[PDB]
Structures are given as structure tokens and as C-alpha cells.
Amino acid sequence: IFSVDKVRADFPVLSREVNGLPLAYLDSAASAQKPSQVIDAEAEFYRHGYAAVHRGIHTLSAQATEKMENVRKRASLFINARSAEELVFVRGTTEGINLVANSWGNSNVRAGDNIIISQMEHHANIVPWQMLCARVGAELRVIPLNPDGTLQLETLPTLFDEKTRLLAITHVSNVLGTENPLAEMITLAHQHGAKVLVDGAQAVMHHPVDVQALDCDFYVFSGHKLYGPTGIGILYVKEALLQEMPPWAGGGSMIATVSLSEGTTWTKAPWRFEAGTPNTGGIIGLGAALEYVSALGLNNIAEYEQNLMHYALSQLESVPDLTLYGPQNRLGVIAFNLGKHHAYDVGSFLDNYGIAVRTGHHCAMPLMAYYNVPAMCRASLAMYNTHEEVDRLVTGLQRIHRLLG
Amino acid sequence: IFSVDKVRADFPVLSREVNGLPLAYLDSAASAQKPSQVIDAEAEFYRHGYAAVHRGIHTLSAQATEKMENVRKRASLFINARSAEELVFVRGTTEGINLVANSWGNSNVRAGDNIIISQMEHHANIVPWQMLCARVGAELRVIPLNPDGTLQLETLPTLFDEKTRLLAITHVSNVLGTENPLAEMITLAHQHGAKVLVDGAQAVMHHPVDVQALDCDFYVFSGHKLYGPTGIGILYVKEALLQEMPPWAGGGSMIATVSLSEGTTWTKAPWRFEAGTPNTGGIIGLGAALEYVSALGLNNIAEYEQNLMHYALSQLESVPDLTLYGPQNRLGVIAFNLGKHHAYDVGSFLDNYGIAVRTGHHCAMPLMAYYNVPAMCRASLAMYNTHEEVDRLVTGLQRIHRLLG
Numbered sequence: 001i002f003s004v005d006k007v008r009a010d011f012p013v014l015s016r017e018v019n020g021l022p023l024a025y026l027d028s029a030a031s032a033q034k035p036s037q038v039i040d041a042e043a044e045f046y047r048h049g050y051a052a053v054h055r056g057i058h059t060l061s062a063q064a065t066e067k068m069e070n071v072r073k074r075a076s077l078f079i080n081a082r083s084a085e086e087l088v089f090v091r092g093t094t095e096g097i098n099l100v101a102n103s104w105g106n107s108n109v110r111a112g113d114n115i116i117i118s119q120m121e122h123h124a125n126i127v128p129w130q131m132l133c134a135r136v137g138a139e140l141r142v143i144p145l146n147p148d149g150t151l152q153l154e155t156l157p158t159l160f161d162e163k164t165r166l167l168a169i170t171h172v173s174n175v176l177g178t179e180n181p182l183a184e185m186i187t188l189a190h191q192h193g194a195k196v197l198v199d200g201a202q203a204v205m206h207h208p209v210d211v212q213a214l215d216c217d218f219y220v221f222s223g224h225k226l227y228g229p230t231g232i233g234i235l236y237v238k239e240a241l242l243q244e245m246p247p248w249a250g251g252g253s254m255i256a257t258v259s260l261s262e263g264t265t266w267t268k269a270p271w272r273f274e275a276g277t278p279n280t281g282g283i284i285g286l287g288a289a290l291e292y293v294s295a296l297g298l299n300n301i302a303e304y305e306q307n308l309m310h311y312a313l314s315q316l317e318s319v320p321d322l323t324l325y326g327p328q329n330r331l332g333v334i335a336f337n338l339g340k341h342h343a344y345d346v347g348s349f350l351d352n353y354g355i356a357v358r359t360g361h362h363c364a365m366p367l368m369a370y371y372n373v374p375a376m377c378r379a380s381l382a383m384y385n386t387h388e389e390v391d392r393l394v395t396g397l398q399r400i401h402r403l404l405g
Numbered sequence: 406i407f408s409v410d411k412v413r414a415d416f417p418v419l420s421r422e423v424n425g426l427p428l429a430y431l432d433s434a435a436s437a438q439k440p441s442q443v444i445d446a447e448a449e450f451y452r453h454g455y456a457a458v459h460r461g462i463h464t465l466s467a468q469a470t471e472k473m474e475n476v477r478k479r480a481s482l483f484i485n486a487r488s489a490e491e492l493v494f495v496r497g498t499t500e501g502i503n504l505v506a507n508s509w510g511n512s513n514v515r516a517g518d519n520i521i522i523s524q525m526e527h528h529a530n531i532v533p534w535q536m537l538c539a540r541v542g543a544e545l546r547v548i549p550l551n552p553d554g555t556l557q558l559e560t561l562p563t564l565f566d567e568k569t570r571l572l573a574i575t576h577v578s579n580v581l582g583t584e585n586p587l588a589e590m591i592t593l594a595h596q597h598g599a600k601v602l603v604d605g606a607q608a609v610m611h612h613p614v615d616v617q618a619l620d621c622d623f624y625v626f627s628g629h630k631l632y633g634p635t636g637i638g639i640l641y642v643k644e645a646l647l648q649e650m651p652p653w654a655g656g657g658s659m660i661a662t663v664s665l666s667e668g669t670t671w672t673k674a675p676w677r678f679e680a681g682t683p684n685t686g687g688i689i690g691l692g693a694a695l696e697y698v699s700a701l702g703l704n705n706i707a708e709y710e711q712n713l714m715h716y717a718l719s720q721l722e723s724v725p726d727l728t729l730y731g732p733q734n735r736l737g738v739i740a741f742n743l744g745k746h747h748a749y750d751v752g753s754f755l756d757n758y759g760i761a762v763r764t765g766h767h768c769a770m771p772l773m774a775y776y777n778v779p780a781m782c783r784a785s786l787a788m789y790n791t792h793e794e795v796d797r798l799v800t801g802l803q804r805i806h807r808l809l810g
């Protein structure tokens with residue numbers, strides 16, 4: 001089993017007060033709070049180990065380079081990659097997806113080809129493909145949704161054909177909490193020679209993720225939602241593909257040699273897509289965030305969060321005129337609207353009770369359009385949230401409905 | 406005046422031991438150590454203020470957004486920009502220069518135009534222009550050096566003509582410590598309608614920098630060399646230019662609206678070039694690093710570093726077969742070789758005495774070629790270094806020369 005009380009004690013922010021009331025942070029899906037072990041790992045690095053990592057000569061630099069490469073190894077085991085050199089450090093999920101669309105997309109998607117996304121994609125997994133499709137004259141196809149917030153799988157035969165170069169799909173919806181059948185969809189994609197990029201930003205923190213078993217070709221996720229620092233994410237790429245990807249945004253440790261008369265050359269795999277100075281502080285902290293989550297056990301985390309969610313959905317039945325979006329087996333997030341009140345207002349009232357939720361379009365406008373609403377509220381129920389916080393949310397919605405109804 | 410002892414006490418790393426000897430960190434030009442005020446600012450943010458900044462509803466998020474925008478304001482005053490909306494947060498100098506070369510370069514440099522750089526440029530200020538010149542069919546011209554490590558200014562009449570769109574020049578050489586006559590060169594560039602991007606990564610920490618007085622069009626620098634965290638830099642752009650720059654690497658707060666049927670639109674100025682989740686931790690810390698440097702006074706810093714340098718250059722006269730590269734009035738860094746010994750070996754011995762210096766090509770290969778050497782040693786003399794550390798360096802070079810000579 002798994003003790004919320006012992007976990008919560010690790011997170012100094014949860015003692016905080018907002019509007020003079022105790023904080024109920026229900027917005028982890030936007031960005032997670034960080035445990036002490038993560039915060040101090042970063043700070044200790046700065047206080048006693050800090051140096052440049054440009055594979056440099058003196059001791060501090062050599063030790064920092066080893067620290068950073070150990071984190072790359074730890075992250076590869078975390079998602080069960082075959083090799084640490086299949087992992088690239090990126091600024092975040094957004095930049096990783098763009099990296100793939102520029103380096104791989106421009107070399108492998110020609111005029112008259114098509115790319116497939118879904119209608120529940122976060123904008124980070126839409127805009128790069130929309131632009132790749134314009135550059136090269138390709139077509140962007142969209143898997144549509146069902147009312148319950150799952151993908152209309154029956155439509156895949158009309159979307160996959162011999163010219164489909166890539167499926168880009170979310171692992172878990174940041175709005176609905178739907179978990180897509182990645183394994184099976186990847187089998188279909190690979191029958192046509194198409195590659196699959198998986199947007200995993202909302203998945204790696206709710207349960208184990210095994211990129212070999214999935215057999216996905218690209219997998220990207222974000223540090224700051226994995227209880228880690230800002231400014232760091234992970235892009236996984238199959239070795240065979242990665243060693244074929246040409247260069248793009250060239251800098252320092254991405255640039256091998258440069259000549260005014262003969263041009264420049266670029267360094268080998270992972271490192272070639274890591275220009276300039278790496279975010280060594282961020283990397284150190286992501287490392288610790290991986291160790292912390294592993295020490296708790298993603299299966300323990302999955303079990304506690306899953307029961308918190310069942311509890312929450314049961315308690316929410318007693319909220320009048322509540323509209324929920326998504327499936328019964330959602331992970332992590334609950335999306336709703338209250339009667340006819342703008343989500344902006346509902347969120348403002350909950351914040352007034354010290355409850356933080358996200359309101360707006362959640363960086364998923366096509367998904368809002370599908371449901372014919374302009375916005376929704378979203379509450380995240382993460383590993384450090386409690387039955388009491390769910391009770392405050394339920395009570396709060398009841399009060400807002402009595403007051404504004 | 407200015408007390409080294411009181412400054413050093415702020416930096417916890419300087420108490421560190423390397424190879425069982427006390428550390429003499431002389432590699433700030435690669436990356437600076439950080440004071441406690443910077444480290445704890447970041448950590449305090451994480452412990453008590455952390456949230457997403459996607460201009461979000463609840464209190465923690467609203468307060469974090471205000472924190473970040475205050476840092477943008479503080480940085481604009483720091484370099485004396487007219488407006489905070491002229492500053493863009495970037496991952497670092499490397500990415501900022503590329504940002505300009507993609508957004509501005511692709512729209513303003515056509516086939517048959519030319520761009521001017523210098524021969525002392527760091528690779529970050531070469532490769533983006535080499536590639537822009539290939540994309541569009543333009544010519545990359547190079548200001549050559551003099552033996553003393555200054556620019557051959559007499560050659561500018563053969564390089565500037567009606568088709569020169571941009572001068573990209575370093576403020577201070579990361580290898581030689583030359584400070585280029587930016588103000589005058591910008592006047593010449595502007596007489597031809599050409600814009601100037603200034604690579605300021607090695608300047609903002611040695612003395613005040615006033616982008617209005619310079620009248621440069623772009624100015625970029627790095628957080629981690631300004632005693633700040635990794636993963637954050639500043640790109641300044643004249644408002645008139647910035648509000649004309651088209652989009653590029655699109656994400657989140659860079660993307661305004663997105664539609665599957667109608668396409669996407671992008672948000673206004675600074676923010677439009679800041680995709681995905683910002684590095685809020687890095688930003689917080691850069692903020693504090695700016696406050697710390699300002700509290701000391703860049704003129705006090707300039708005075709102490711300038712005298713440390715005069716002292717160092719005087720003491721180094723007593724080192725046999727020392728070769729120095731650069732001018733007498735260098736800022737910040739000393740580049741040298743010892744007799745005929747590979748810089749790799751010299752650096753290894755100094756590290757053995759606990760002295761950290763950088764060896765290699767310093768991300769400036771064209772500059773090494775100019776001097777017909779493969780590598781150099783470089784020692785940085787920053788605001789927390791001491792006469793004693795200079796004495797250890799001098800003694801160490803004398804010993805290495807006796808032993809290996």
C-alpha cells in the first residue's frame with residue numbers, strides 16, 4: 001500500500017495558504033508540485049558540483065558531465081528504452097514534438113503524403129504537423145471523437161493508406177483523461193510503414209510506460225509534470241531512426257567542427273539535437289524526480305490515484321447540473337461545466353475557497369469545438385491529493401450552484 | 406570599493422575541494438558559479454510559489470505569472486531597454502541567435518544579399534548565419550583579425566555594401582577578451598540600412614550595458630554566465646523590428662487559436678516566441694542573479710576585475726615560454742599556450758593542482774585557425790577570484806614548465 005500523509009509531507013507547497021484558506025492544489029495536469037528531494041537535489045548541485053559540461057577538462061566539469069549522462073541512463077530505464085543514446089534532452093514536450101517534425105518530418109514526408117492526428121490532441125501535437133503539411137504539400141487527417149471522449153476507431157480504414165507517413169497520437173488526454181489503445185494503433189500504423197509519435201506528457205506519472213512493448217517510434221514527455229523542474233523534457237527515438245535524422249537548430253555539442261571555408265559538421269546521435277549549454281540544473285532535478293517516483297512505485301501511485309478518482313466521481317454525482325466530459329475510466333483529470341455558468345466564473349469561485357483548478361480551453365480548442373463549448377473546468381487528482389480535497393471541491397460546486405443558480 | 410572576501414562568502418562552491426586541494430575556479434567564462442541568493446530564490450519559488458503560468462485562473466498561477474513578468478521588467482532595466490516587451494526569454498544565447506536567423510533572417514535576407522560576421526565569433530554566432538546564407542542564396546562575409554586579436558577595421562569598406570542586410574558581431578570575445586567598438590560599427594551598419602545583432606554573452610557581467618546608447622537591433626546573452634541558473638537567456642529586440650517578426654517554432658502561449666478547418670493564429674510580441682511552458686524556475690533565478698549583480702554594482706565589479714587582470718598579466722611575465730593571445734586591454738579571460746606542450750596536458754596538470762581552466766577550441770575554431778594552433782588554455786578572472794588564485798596559476802605554469810620542459 002501507499003500513504004498519502006507520508007507523501008504529502010514531502011511537498012512543502014501543500015502547507016501553503018491561498019486567500020487565507022488552506023490550498024487544495026487540483027491543477028497538477030497543468031504542472032505538478034515538486035517534492036523536497038527534487039528541489040534540494042538541484043540546489044545541492046548548484047552549491048557543491050556546478051560547472052560547464054562541454055566535455056571539459058577539469059574535475060568539476062568532468063563530474064558534471066557524468067551526472068548528466070547518468071540521468072539520461074536513469075530516464076532510459078524509466079521508460080524501458082534499449083539504450084540511453086535513444087533519449088534526447090529537450091526543453092519540454094512542445095519542443096520535442098517540433099524537433100521531430102523538423103528533423104524527421106522534412107526528410108520523410110513529401111507532397112501528396114498524409115499525416116494522422118486525433119481530435120483530442122493538445123496544440124503541441126497539432127501545430128507542428130499543420131506546418132509540416134504546409135511546407136511539403138501533405139495532408140493532415142484527423143481521427144474524430146465519440147461523445148464519451150474516446151476515439152472513433154472505426155474511421156481508421158478511411159484515414160490510413162499507402163501514403164500515410166506518421167501517426168501522432170496522445171497517450172492520455174490532458175482534458176478528458178482518455179487513455180488511447182496505443183499498442184494496437186501502432187500495429188496498424190506499422191502495417192503501412194507509417195511511424196508513430198506518442199505524446200506521453202500526461203502518462204508517465206500515472207503508471208509504468210514501456211516503449212519497447214509499445215513499439216512506438218517517438219515518445220515525448222515533460223519534466224515539470226513529472227514532479228520535476230521546469231525547462232526540461234525527454235524525447236525518445238528508436239536508435240535506427242535517430243541515427244538517420246539530419247540536423248536543424250545548431251549550437252554547441254550539436255556543432256562538431258566549423259570552418260569559414262569548408263562549412264560545419266555535426267556530432268553523432270543524442271547529442272546532435274542538444275545545442276548550446278544543456279539545462280544541467282533541470283537535468284539534475286529530473287533525475288531526482290525520477291528516483292522519487294520510482295521509490296514510491298508507479299503501480300502504488302496508479303492504485304491510489306485510481307481509487308481517489310472513483311471516490312471523486314461517486315461524490316460528484318450529488319452535484320446538480322454538473323456536466324462531465326470524457327469516459328468512466330479517466331486517468332488523472334476531471335473535465336466539467338456547472339449548469340450554464342461560464343467556466344471562468346466557476347473557477348474564480350473555487351479559487352476563492354482556496355481550490356486551484358484550470359479553466360479555459362486547456363490548449364485543446366478542437367476538442368472544445370467538438371463538444372460545442374468555449375471552455376471547461378478541469379480538476380487534476382494526483383498522488384498527493386486527498387478525499388478531503390475532493391469533498392471541498394464537491395461542496396464548493398454545490399455552493400456555487402446555490403448562489404449563482 | 407568592493408570586498409572580494411564578502412563576495413566569495415556568498416558562493417558555497419568556492420569552499421569545495423578538488424583532488425584534495427582547495428579549488429581555484431578559473432572557468433567562469435564557460436559558466437559562472439552562483440551565489441546563495443540566486444540558488445535559494447529558485448528553491449523558495451519551488452517550495453512556496455510554484456504553479457503553471459499559462460495566464461491561469463487560480464491564485465498561485467496568477468502570482469507566478471506576475472513573478473515572471475517582473476523579471477522581464479527587471480532585465481529590461483538592466484540593459485536599459487525602452488520597454489519590457491522588447492525582451493524575449495530564450496533557452497540561451499545559442500537559441501536566441503538562431504531565433505533571429507529563422508524569424509527575421511528568412512524574411513529579410515534574399516538571394517544575392519550578404520551578411521557580415523567577424524573571425525573571432527563563437528560558433529553560436531557563425532553556424533546560424535552559414536545556414537541562413539545557404540537557404541536563401543546569400544553570401545557570408547568575414548571581418549578578419551589582427552595578430553593582437555582585434556578586428557581589422559580597415560577592411561569594412563570592402564565588406565559593407567548596399568546588399569548587406571545584417572552585421573552579427575561579438576561584444577566581448579569569449580577567448581581573447583577583446584571588446585569590439587560596437588557603437589561605431591553600428592553607425593556604419595545603419596548607414597547602409599543593415600541591422601546589427603550583438604552577441605553579448607561575455608559582456609553583461611563585466612560592466613554596464615546600455616542597448617539604447619549602442620542602438621543595436623538585437624542583443625542576446627546567457628543566464629548561466631551571469632551568475633544565474635542554467636536553461637535561460639535573454640534576447641533583446643527593437644520594438645519596431647520585434648512586432649514585425651513572423652512565427653517559427655510554435656507551442657503554448659506562442660499559439661493563440663488553433664482550428665482543424667481554419668488553421669492557427671499566434672499571439673502578439675514577446676510572448677509569440679516563447680513556446681510551451683516557460684522555464685519559470687530559471688526565470689526566477691535569473692531575476693535574483695540580476696538583483697545580486699546590481700546590488701554589487703557593475704562599476705565596482707569592473708574595477709576589481711580590471712585590477713585582478715592587470716595583476717595577473719604582470720605576474721605572468723615571469724612564466725617562461727608563455728604565449729598569450731589577444732590585446733593588452735582584455736576583459737575577463739586570458740588565453741595562452743605553454744611552450745610546445747599540448748593545451749590538453751597543461752590543463753590536466755593545473756586541474757591536478759585544483760585549478761580549473763578551459764582547454765580546447767573554445768567553440769571558436771576559425772579563431773584557432775587564425776593563430777595556427779589547434780587549441781589554447783583559457784583562464785577566467787571573475788569577480789570572486791583573488792590574487793592568491795592568480796599566484797597559484799603562475800606557480801603552476803612554472804612547475805609544469807620545469808617538469809615537462
Ligand SMILES: *Cc1c(COP(=O)(O)O)cnc(C)c1O
Pocket residue numbers: 029030091092093094095122124125170172173174199200201202222223233657681682
Ligand atoms: C502540457 C502538455 C503538453 C505541453 O508540454 P510542455 O511541457 O508545456 O511543453 C503537450 N501535450 C500534452 C498532452 C500535455 O499535457
Ligand SMILES: *Cc1c(COP(=O)(O)O)cnc(C)c1O
Pocket residue numbers: 252276277434435496497498499500527529530575577578579604605606607627628638
Ligand atoms: C558561451 C557563449 C555563447 C553560447 O551561449 P549558451 O548560453 O551556451 O547557449 C555564445 N557566444 C558567446 C560569446 C559565449 O561566451
